[PDB]
Design a protein around this ligand. Structure first.
Ligand SMILES: Cc1cc(Nc2ccccc2C)n2cnnc2n1
Length: 127
């Protein structure tokens, strides 16, 4: 029923890159999803105490959220775009696994994921 420590967002010994694909993931992908009217439940780690979800972290072992992704992008945490893309997909998948079809939170994730898929379809060529 307790919250775990958050996912890692800083590690000075992890090698980093600044690339046009990662720039796109922040400037287009993250920004598009973040400003959406369904973003709010996804803008920070799931607070299982606040939301009375005592079994959430019993079930979900790789938590992920856009707050974490935002910090990772803004802090240059990643080596490549696929790392970041995986974080988004983990976020959506966690939601789908924990909840039931047609749940409000699932419909919200589905709408964000539709936008996500469109932007990723348009992922720029590597410079
Ligand atoms: C990503 C996510 C969020 C929530 N609940 C929620 C609702 C409103 C505001 C904040 C939060 C964290 N979830 C509830 N069950 N799975 C969930 N997944």
């Amino acid at each position: 029923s307790m919250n775990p420590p958050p996912p890692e967002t800083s590690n000075p010994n992890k090698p980093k890159r600044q690339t046009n694909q990662l720039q796109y993931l922040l400037r287009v992908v993250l920004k598009t999803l973040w400003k959406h009217q369904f973003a709010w439940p996804f803008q920070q780690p799931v607070d299982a105490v606040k939301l009375n979800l005592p079994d959430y972290y019993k079930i979900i072992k790789t938590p992920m959220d856009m707050g974490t992704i935002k910090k990772r992008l803004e802090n240059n945490y990643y080596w490549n775009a696929q790392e970041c893309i995986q974080d988004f997909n983990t976020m959506f998948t966690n939601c789908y696994i924990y909840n039931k079809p047609g749940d409000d939170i699932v419909l919200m994730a589905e709408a964000l994921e539709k936008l996500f898929l469109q932007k990723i379809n348009e992922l720029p060529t590597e410079e």
